[PDB]
Design an enzyme around this catalytic site. Structure first.
Site, PDB file in Angstrom:
ATOM      1  N   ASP A   1     -21.463 -12.788  31.405  1.00  0.00           N
ATOM      2  CA  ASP A   1     -20.709 -12.501  32.648  1.00  0.00           C
ATOM      3  C   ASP A   1     -20.064 -13.733  33.301  1.00  0.00           C
ATOM      4  O   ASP A   1     -19.671 -13.710  34.466  1.00  0.00           O
ATOM      5  CB  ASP A   1     -21.585 -11.733  33.647  1.00  0.00           C
ATOM      6  CG  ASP A   1     -21.834 -10.299  33.217  1.00  0.00           C
ATOM      7  OD1 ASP A   1     -20.982  -9.731  32.499  1.00  0.00           O
ATOM      8  OD2 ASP A   1     -22.883  -9.734  33.599  1.00  0.00           O
ATOM      9  N   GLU A   2     -19.956 -14.800  32.522  1.00  0.00           N
ATOM     10  CA  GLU A   2     -19.229 -15.995  32.900  1.00  0.00           C
ATOM     11  C   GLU A   2     -18.236 -16.200  31.770  1.00  0.00           C
ATOM     12  O   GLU A   2     -18.115 -15.346  30.883  1.00  0.00           O
ATOM     13  CB  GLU A   2     -20.184 -17.182  33.043  1.00  0.00           C
ATOM     14  CG  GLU A   2     -21.232 -17.007  34.143  1.00  0.00           C
ATOM     15  CD  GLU A   2     -20.614 -16.904  35.533  1.00  0.00           C
ATOM     16  OE1 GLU A   2     -19.475 -17.376  35.720  1.00  0.00           O
ATOM     17  OE2 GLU A   2     -21.265 -16.354  36.446  1.00  0.00           O
TER      18      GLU A   2
END
Lengths: 280, 278, 280, 279
Positions: free
Chosen positions: D224-225
């Site tokens: 999620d980065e």
């Protein structure tokens, strides 16, 4: 030309009725009327604006309202038509929020009177003086923190301030001062990279490539920079925004977010609800 | 799980009390309350949400409210928790607003049921059918304008629709049908910074930096009457006329969708020739 | 620390090439570069920012650019890094746009210097004086309109102003003055009800029930209030906004819309394109 | 009717010249031109739109560009006028982002062709079929994570897809697949004023936040980065209970993903170290 009545109490049947029936009996003409009952916190909230009758008995109106409010555990605040809160703005070296608040005050957007600007540094004295607002520089002796804060509190008490605005005041407030200012001191800080405690949070935002920078206006309590959120906002940024530009957009959103919060507060719209706010 | 009660009556001391005291006597637990007293039009407006009591006598509540209201000349509307307005959408050739409305209905954003699409053309039949919605093509005979409008009004009645949406329906309604639909027919049109053949081309040449749209209730004044919602879309020099028209569609879609939402959430009130949206 | 170069010419092949190749040969390091070719108007527009080299020959850079531009019928303008346009603001009795511009000037948002405030009335002198900006009250004798305008134009000439801002200056400009100010005087007006010429347009907007009020910033030409549009905006209003509230929202949107326009102009972003503008 | 040329290369005097002088020699009529020189990353980015000449030699243009670019270490992409990227949308049980993407595609707003919907569950099969798009259900055997991803990666290759959109696809991708999809897989998730663990919207409700947000990004090894393409927020207030916040959450995920997909398919997004430049 209208009076403002705010009330709050534990949720029960008849909470709108007790304010509304009393306002009718008192021949107070409701011009507008907003209310909310939070089903999670169990608290009721009401904002009412009204036009007073002729021969308006304010004292007996409060006393009669205090009497009926007892059964509900209800607390209320009544604000006259022309009421302008006296405000103390606290500043350090950043002048952006101070400039914005005084500009909005001057053009009549924020109906308040700034009665002093209080600072831990001497730097913003010329700015305050240009606005003809009394300026106070109470330098901190690290050894004597309560001494600096007694002088700050003395100005706030002497001027009769009913709101304190922390416009990027960087000296940490003691826990005694925080309790003393409970519910009437509004602070503003940036909301970049939640959970990053580095000294250059904007350079860090740049390197991470964010497309927004943010800010939160809150009431002061014992939790540093947390405590009841009044307003939040963001400003769009992009790749062409270098760190200084990002810092600059940060100042913008701090300015705007604080002014909104301060406006909500002086317009009698903000209520405390457990650890959060309702804004009617 | 909450009922909605709206009230509209002439302004007087104790108009809030009549509704709120009644709600209290009826053990209706109020969850929120919004009101406005227009000092110019002399009208008071209130919208209240509440949770019904156990064994709620609905007929007795409405009856008890009608008796309290006669003394105030007050008009109220009470909407049940699960209520989904039946809706007729009228279309001509442009599909942008119909697409947007049926999409928002399907994903649950507009709590309504589209019971019919009616048109003066056959062209959007396949679209209505793909969504499994009854489609009616009632062609216009220029001689018999009352004849075509009789068929349209039949469908509106037979399906029992309580809202009619003109999603770029381009046939002019008669004064008779306009009267009939007064207060429950919503129209959408463009709003620019022009009057003639190609409005977006005239916008391009004038160099406008926005396009707009207005959703409103229908009355006898063509494309005027009671305004519900307005909006604009930013444009620049890189938007050629066809780009302009495309942006126009987007803002018609968004503005109409907003207005339809206000109406079905019981937030819109007629106030002389304008609206109050609570 | 960057030079700004803007060019425009009749559309043809090699319009980006003639500027881009010349910047290369001159060792001017392009930092960013935006262009647009309008297919309806047949006009090309380019904005380029560059870092100058050491020993930067400005005179010979212009001359050599003038030379190559001839084949394209190209006009260009070149702006040094530190350049701050000198500005004259014209005002009547409405102070909202003047306050906004001077506030934005002071905080550094508008990189300009206001060299004079010119007025047909004496009212806003205290506001100009508080900012330490020279103020000029040139009353109109209805019999001598050219006499009032000669004084205005004298102040503009003497201060070396390169932009004039009409901040709700209500005295109609003559056609002679309009031609004289062509392409460097920016006006602001409300855009409420297109083609309603009544004396109370905000009361008319109230009665009609609008949910927006609007404004247009434009360049001045011989067409009154029309002429090249630079920026337009709207502000949301609603049923609770009475006429005075609506008038107040109008002021807000006049302020914002003018400031964006003026910002676009001073950043060298705005080009005239037939009877309209391109903003790069 | 316009070709799109994007280039990025290391920053030097004459990077714009090499593209523009080439375009000129090739009689490519430039209609629009945007560039950025990032002085921190040392990278130059350019997006040019042009009209082709009569009898345009496409091989000779690309070839002649490749030769001039050698001396600059320059990477370029040339997209034909009517190009519609083939796209695979991956989904689990949440249908909001898939609905929004398929709606936008159908109305002409995202100029792409969804060639396949791939999922770790059978639940959204009817939704894909209603749109007449091939649906693939590849259940996860937790002992064979490479087995499930082999079938997903097969569909992506067989369909010839040049963009993978993770429309709330909830199975964790492996470092091997992440590495494979670098720079052409776009993911969406929520962003709050920032809440670790169970029930982030319930935590946001209690905290009294006044916005909910979302972040569309390219996929890499960090969960999620990875390179951020677009961010947005949606206003909320006290009247929004937890399930109201979840609904607004969905709205902003939808809007933010659609904007980012839009930037990507319009050839406006460039990788810039661990970030993006969007022209």
């Amino acid at each position: 030309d209208t009076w403002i009545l705010t009330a709050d109490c534990p949720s029960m049947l008849g909470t709108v009725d007790v304010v509304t029936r009393y306002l009718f009996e008192q021949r107070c003409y409701v011009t507008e009327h907003h209310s909310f009952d939070d089903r999670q916190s169990g608290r009721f909230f009401i904002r009412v604006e009204f036009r007073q009758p002729d021969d308006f008995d304010e004292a007996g109106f409060r006393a009669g309202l205090a009497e009926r409010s007892e059964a509900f555990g209800m607390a209320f605040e009544l604000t006259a038509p022309n009421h302008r809160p006296k405000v103390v703005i606290m500043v350090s070296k950043a002048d952006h929020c101070l400039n914005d608040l005084l500009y909005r005050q001057r053009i009549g957007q924020l109906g308040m009177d700034v009665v002093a600007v209080v600072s831990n540094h001497p730097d913003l004295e010329p700015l305050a003086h240009w606005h003809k607002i009394p300026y106070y520089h109470f330098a901190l002796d690290p050894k004597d923190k309560p001494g600096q804060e007694r002088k700050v509190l003395q100005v706030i008490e002497e001027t009769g301030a009913e709101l304190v605005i922390l416009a990027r005041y960087m000296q940490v407030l003691s826990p005694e001062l925080c309790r003393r200012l409970d519910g009437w001191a509004i602070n503003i800080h940036h909301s970049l990279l939640p959970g990053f405690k580095g000294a250059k949070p904007y350079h860090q935002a740049y390197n991470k490539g964010v497309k927004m920078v943010g800010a939160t206006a809150h009431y002061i309590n014992n939790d540093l920079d947390e405590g009841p959120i009044i307003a939040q906002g963001v400003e769009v940024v992009d790749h062409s925004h270098y760190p200084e530009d990002l810092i600059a957009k940060g100042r913008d959103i701090e300015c705007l977010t604080l002014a909104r919060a301060v406006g909500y507060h002086i317009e009698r719209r903000v209520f405390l609800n457990a650890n959060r706010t309702v804004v009617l």
